[PDB]
Write an enzyme that holds these catalytic residues in place. Structure first.
Site, PDB file in Angstrom:
ATOM      1  N   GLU A 188       0.848  -1.201   0.000  1.00 14.38           N
ATOM      2  CA  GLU A 188       0.000   0.000   0.000  1.00 14.38           C
ATOM      3  C   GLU A 188       0.882   1.249   0.000  1.00 14.38           C
ATOM      4  OE1 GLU A 188      -2.983   0.181  -0.731  1.00 14.38           O
ATOM      5  OE2 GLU A 188      -3.982  -1.693  -0.177  1.00 14.38           O
ATOM      6  N   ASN A 193      -7.677   8.636  -6.126  1.00 17.99           N
ATOM      7  CA  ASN A 193      -8.505   7.659  -6.863  1.00 17.99           C
ATOM      8  C   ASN A 193      -9.210   8.390  -8.012  1.00 17.99           C
ATOM      9  OD1 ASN A 193      -9.026   6.407  -3.579  1.00 17.99           O
ATOM     10  ND2 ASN A 193      -7.640   5.570  -5.118  1.00 17.99           N
ATOM     11  N   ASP A 201     -12.278   8.391  -8.672  1.00 16.23           N
ATOM     12  CA  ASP A 201     -13.600   8.877  -8.196  1.00 16.23           C
ATOM     13  C   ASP A 201     -13.416  10.212  -7.467  1.00 16.23           C
ATOM     14  OD1 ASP A 201     -12.680   8.081  -5.681  1.00 16.23           O
ATOM     15  OD2 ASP A 201     -14.374   6.767  -5.227  1.00 16.23           O
ATOM     16  N   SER A 236     -11.797  10.469  -4.509  1.00 14.02           N
ATOM     17  CA  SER A 236     -11.432  10.139  -3.114  1.00 14.02           C
ATOM     18  C   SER A 236      -9.900  10.032  -3.084  1.00 14.02           C
ATOM     19  CB  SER A 236     -12.115   8.891  -2.609  1.00 14.02           C
ATOM     20  OG  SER A 236     -11.601   7.749  -3.267  1.00 14.02           O
ATOM     21  N   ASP A 283      -6.573   8.059  -0.836  1.00 14.00           N
ATOM     22  CA  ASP A 283      -6.062   7.050   0.123  1.00 14.00           C
ATOM     23  C   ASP A 283      -4.890   7.674   0.892  1.00 14.00           C
ATOM     24  OD1 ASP A 283      -7.786   5.220  -1.189  1.00 14.00           O
ATOM     25  OD2 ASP A 283      -6.146   4.416  -2.372  1.00 14.00           O
ATOM     26  N   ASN A 300      -9.133   5.088   2.698  1.00 12.99           N
ATOM     27  CA  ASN A 300      -9.784   5.947   1.679  1.00 12.99           C
ATOM     28  C   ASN A 300     -10.788   6.899   2.327  1.00 12.99           C
ATOM     29  OD1 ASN A 300     -11.634   3.173   1.103  1.00 12.99           O
ATOM     30  ND2 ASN A 300     -12.736   5.141   1.094  1.00 12.99           N
TER      31      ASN A 300
END
Ligand code: NA
Length: 129
Positions: free
Chosen positions: A35, A46, A48, A50, A52, A59
């Site tokens: 990660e 992301n 969309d 959003s 992380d 997220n």
């Protein structure tokens, strides 16, 4: 902060992540490796919109507030910035809520694709725990 492998395994164990919801410590260390490369300051945007955040790339769609993810929740009741701290307490406490959400560690797509079913104990091999 960039953790060492065994340093992060020790911090996760102290915060009670070892065998949390039945996931052995090497599962959590493996997830953090892919990660964030063990970097508490890791961020990823992301498609969309959003974001992380942190060692476990939590997220903003569900888990933290960053003020810039329309329609999102903050189920960990934290600013996403808390997930970038050198202190992993916020990340661990929020990861416990995520892994309790029904799909276990499949919530972390990198865990499913790169850790799940592998020899995850290798991630804590030689650590003094
Ligand atoms: Na949010």
């Amino acid at each position: 902060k960039v953790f060492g492998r065994c340093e992060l395994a020790a911090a996760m164990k102290r915060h009670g992540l070892d065998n949390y919801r039945g996931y052995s410590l090497g599962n959590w260390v493996c997830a953090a490796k892919f990660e964030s490369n063990f970097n508490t300051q890791a961020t990823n945007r992301n498609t969309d919109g959003s974001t992380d955040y942190g060692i476990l790339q939590i997220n903003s769609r569900w888990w933290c507030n960053d003020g810039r993810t329309p329609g999102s929740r903050n189920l960990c009741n934290i600013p996403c910035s808390a997930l970038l701290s050198s202190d992993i307490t916020a990340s661990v406490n929020c990861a416990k809520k995520i892994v309790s959400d029904g799909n276990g560690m499949n919530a972390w797509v990198a865990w499913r694709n790169r850790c799940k079913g592998t020899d995850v104990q290798a991630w804590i091999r030689g650590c003094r725990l």
